[PDB]
Design a protein around this ligand. Structure first.
Ligand SMILES: */C=C\C(=O)Nc1cccc(Cn2nc(C#Cc3c(F)cc4nc(C)[nH]c4c3F)c(C(N)=O)c2N)c1
Length: 303
């Protein structure tokens, strides 16, 4: 009420049409709760949709608020795509700011993959394992992420933290890139500081991002290579046993993670190409999409 929150009639949802439910997850993407929205779709005003609702914490500063507004406005400018988390609406009047986005019921991609490990990869940590993925399913996962990044890059959006923990999976097994709308911090950052889930984002950074804080579409392609490695280890942890100060050394001297046990030579070579030392020599997302499209069609669904 103290601030001028922007009301956009095309996106604004009355507060009374949002039935809030349980908090979602452990807060990696903010204070997010599950909800049911009534009549999100103006042609179907009596139908309910499950949605995720982002809000600010109790300790939120004016900086946290401006960031959430900016994230909302950035999602509008980027537009809709099947393979990103899409904006569905917002509540800016008669209460705290709510930003309403698509709900992904199967967790992030790392958790999705780990729960589908065969009991025979590292162990399956889920107490209720889910059915194993085919080789085609895994390549299709990579294809969908590539398609989401190709769309984001076409809108001049650089993700800067592309990783399996930032891909969410819907009930229909659609991959959606998350947390792309975020303004870049104006301060320098700590290379050793984990997120709230304890991830160590330096292991997804291209060397030019590591050493000189240069982020481009080409550095997202490097991260995509790390994500491909995460997919074919079914949620593995990159650079196992390598401390940060080692990692800096190792990348400079030109080594790269070893191929996952269950990964074709062709997909490993795509990983290695994404990890070209020279940014200009990496594939583009346009090329990756085309190549993964072809690989999906040729990859067996039988094992
Ligand atoms: C740190 C531990 C932790 O909480 N991990 C974790 C993993 C997977 C899923 C969840 C819970 N969860 N969060 C979301 C979300 C979201 C979301 C927004 F609210 C707003 C966004 N803007 C942009 C550009 N991306 C956004 C985004 F992903 C969801 C969900 N949408 O379904 C779930 N289930 C917690």
């Amino acid at each position: 009420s103290e601030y001028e929150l922007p009301e956009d009639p095309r996106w604004e949802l009355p507060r009374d049409r949002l039935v809030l439910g349980k908090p979602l997850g452990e807060g990696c993407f903010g204070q997010v709760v599950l909800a049911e929205a009534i009549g999100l779709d103006k042609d179907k005003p009596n139908r309910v949709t499950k949605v995720a609702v982002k809000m600010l914490k109790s300790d939120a500063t004016e900086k946290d608020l401006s960031d959430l507004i900016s994230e909302m406005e950035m999602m509008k400018m980027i537009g809709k795509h099947k393979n990103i988390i899409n904006l569905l609406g917002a509540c800016t009047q008669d209460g705290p700011l709510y930003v309403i986005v698509e709900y992904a019921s199967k967790g992030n991609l790392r958790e999705y993959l780990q729960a589908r490990r065969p009991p025979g990869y590292s162990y399956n940590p889920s107490h209720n394992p889910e059915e194993q993925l085919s080789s085609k399913d895994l390549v299709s996962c990579a294809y969908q992420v590539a398609r989401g990044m190709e769309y984001l890059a076409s809108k001049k959006c650089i993700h800067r933290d592309l990783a399996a923990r930032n891909v969410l999976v819907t009930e229909d097994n659609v991959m959606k890139i998350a947390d792309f709308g975020l303004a870049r911090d104006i301060h320098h950052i700590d290379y050793y500081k984990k997120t709230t889930n304890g991830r160590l984002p330096v292991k997804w950074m291209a060397p030019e991002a590591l050493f000189d804080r240069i982020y481009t579409h080409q550095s997202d392609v490097w991260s995509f290579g790390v994500l491909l490695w995460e997919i074919f280890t079914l949620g593995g942890s990159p650079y196992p046993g390598v401390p940060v100060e080692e990692l800096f050394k190792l990348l400079k001297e030109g080594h790269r993670m070893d191929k996952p046990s269950n990964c074709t030579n062709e997909l490993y070579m795509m990983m290695r190409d994404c990890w070209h030392a020279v940014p200009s020599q990496r594939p583009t997302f346009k090329q990756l999409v085309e190549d993964l499209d072809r690989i999906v069609a040729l990859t067996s669904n039988q094992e």
